[PDB]
Design an enzyme around this catalytic site. Structure first.
Site, short mmCIF file in Angstrom:
data_model
loop_
_atom_site.label_atom_id
_atom_site.label_comp_id
_atom_site.label_asym_id
_atom_site.label_seq_id
_atom_site.Cartn_x
_atom_site.Cartn_y
_atom_site.Cartn_z
N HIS A 240 8.38 5.57 -9.34
CA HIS A 240 8.30 4.59 -8.26
C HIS A 240 6.98 3.86 -8.18
O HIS A 240 6.99 2.74 -7.75
CB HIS A 240 8.80 5.06 -6.86
CG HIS A 240 8.30 6.40 -6.41
ND1 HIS A 240 7.29 6.54 -5.46
CD2 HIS A 240 8.74 7.66 -6.67
CE1 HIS A 240 7.13 7.81 -5.17
NE2 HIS A 240 7.96 8.52 -5.93
N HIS B 116 -2.18 5.27 -4.74
CA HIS B 116 -1.18 4.52 -5.54
C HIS B 116 -1.17 3.09 -4.98
O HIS B 116 -1.76 2.79 -3.95
CB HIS B 116 0.20 5.19 -5.47
CG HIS B 116 0.71 5.20 -4.07
ND1 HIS B 116 0.40 6.24 -3.19
CD2 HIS B 116 1.44 4.31 -3.33
CE1 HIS B 116 0.91 5.98 -1.99
NE2 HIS B 116 1.55 4.82 -2.05
N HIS C 258 1.52 -0.58 -4.35
CA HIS C 258 2.82 -1.25 -4.36
C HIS C 258 2.52 -2.69 -4.75
O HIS C 258 1.48 -3.23 -4.33
CB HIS C 258 3.44 -1.22 -2.95
CG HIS C 258 3.59 0.16 -2.39
ND1 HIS C 258 4.77 0.87 -2.44
CD2 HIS C 258 2.65 0.98 -1.85
CE1 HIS C 258 4.55 2.07 -1.86
NE2 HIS C 258 3.28 2.19 -1.53
N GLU D 236 3.19 -4.12 1.37
CA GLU D 236 4.14 -3.52 2.29
C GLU D 236 3.81 -4.02 3.70
O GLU D 236 4.70 -4.62 4.36
CB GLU D 236 4.06 -1.97 2.19
CG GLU D 236 4.43 -1.53 0.82
CD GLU D 236 5.04 -0.16 0.80
OE1 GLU D 236 4.36 0.79 1.23
OE2 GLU D 236 6.20 -0.03 0.38
N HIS E 106 -2.76 2.29 -1.35
CA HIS E 106 -2.65 3.34 -0.33
C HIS E 106 -3.46 4.56 -0.79
O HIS E 106 -3.10 5.18 -1.83
CB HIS E 106 -1.20 3.77 -0.17
CG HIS E 106 -0.41 2.70 0.51
ND1 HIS E 106 0.98 2.62 0.50
CD2 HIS E 106 -0.85 1.65 1.29
CE1 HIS E 106 1.37 1.56 1.21
NE2 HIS E 106 0.29 0.94 1.71
N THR F 39 6.18 5.24 3.55
CA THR F 39 7.00 4.04 3.29
C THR F 39 8.02 4.27 2.17
O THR F 39 8.72 3.33 1.80
CB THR F 39 6.12 2.85 2.91
OG1 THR F 39 5.50 3.14 1.65
CG2 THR F 39 5.09 2.56 4.01
#
Ligand SMILES: NS(=O)(=O)c1ccc(C(=O)NCC(F)(F)F)cc1
Ligand SMILES: [Zn+2]
Length: 257
Positions: free
Chosen positions: A61, A91, A93, A103, A116, A195
């Site tokens: 992911h 990590h 996104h 996000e 994050h 999330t």
């Protein structure tokens, strides 16, 4: 299981994780005109001098840079927090294009990516106990925009080739996460959730106002990663972000006037 496609993406997650429709879900849109300055909020204390990074992992992911959290090395304190939160991993996104990927959003503006830095409250002893508590985690969120290169990100970009597919890991020692911070530590804060499934409502969110700049070449390397495992059909790891969720009965507080 769950993921980011049309068949298993965020709109589906509630079927296996009914807390997806809960009262304190993340991310949210930060309306800058409605967030209120809270003069009682303390400066954040980001103490990363003794951080010990160990490994980087493609988990299907995102990719996680993992730290040794078996003692109070890299910790977050202050701001809205009580007690001491240990850094466990960070990590990102990100998007398929520069106009999406974050996000959280700010006045509905999407950034290219969001970092994050995940920390857990040491009063609960271990991470798995902390994620069961409403004050178990503190996640420091930092927006990425595309412009000049971030020198402190390059060591991460250069190892990504070695963890291209799900379940690959690599040694990643001596990485200093202070090189991923912006100049200012002004922030917004609100109570929220993980999330990604299981979407637990255990996070104090701390979102920095100042984005960091990364280059187009840096973010291009994130987009070469794969959601799939080795030998499986290639699915580029892009658009691994959850959209904004209802704010409901919450207030976003600003640390700054
Ligand atoms: N920073 S974030 O994207 O909200 C985020 C941070 C951490 C986790 C996580 O540890 N999931 C694994 C767990 F806890 F076993 F469920 C998930 C989401
Ligand atoms: Zn995240």
């Amino acid at each position: 299981h769950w993921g980011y496609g049309k068949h298993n993406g965020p709109e589906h997650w509630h079927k296996d994780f009914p807390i997806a429709k809960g009262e304190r879900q993340s991310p949210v849109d930060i309306d800058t005109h409605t967030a209120k300055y809270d003069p009682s909020l303390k400066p954040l204390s980001v103490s990363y001098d003794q951080a010990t990074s160990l490994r980087i992992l493609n988990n299907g992911h995102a990719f996680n840079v993992e730290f040794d959290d078996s003692q109070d090395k890299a910790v977050l304190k202050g701001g809205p927090l009580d007690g001491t939160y240990r850094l466990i991993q960070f990590h990102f996104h990100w998007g398929s294009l520069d106009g999406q990927g974050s996000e959280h959003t700010v006045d509905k503006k999407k950034y290219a990516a969001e970092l994050h830095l995940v920390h857990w409250n040491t009063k609960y002893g271990d991470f798995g106990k902390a994620v069961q508590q409403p004050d178990g985690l503190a996640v420091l969120g930092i927006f990425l925009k595309v412009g000049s290169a971030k020198p402190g990100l390059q060591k991460v970009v250069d190892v990504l080739d070695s963890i291209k597919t799900k379940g690959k890991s690599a040694d990643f020692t001596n990485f200093d996460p202070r090189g991923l911070l912006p100049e200012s530590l002004d922030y917004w804060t609100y109570p929220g959730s993980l999330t990604t499934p299981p979407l637990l409502e255990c996070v104090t969110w701390i979102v920095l106002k100042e984005p960091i700049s990364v280059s187009s070449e840096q973010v291009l390397k994130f987009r070469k990663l794969n959601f799939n495992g080795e030998g499986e059909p290639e699915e580029l790891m892009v658009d691994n972000w959850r959209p904004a969720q209802p704010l409901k009965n919450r207030q976003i507080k600003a640390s700054f006037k």
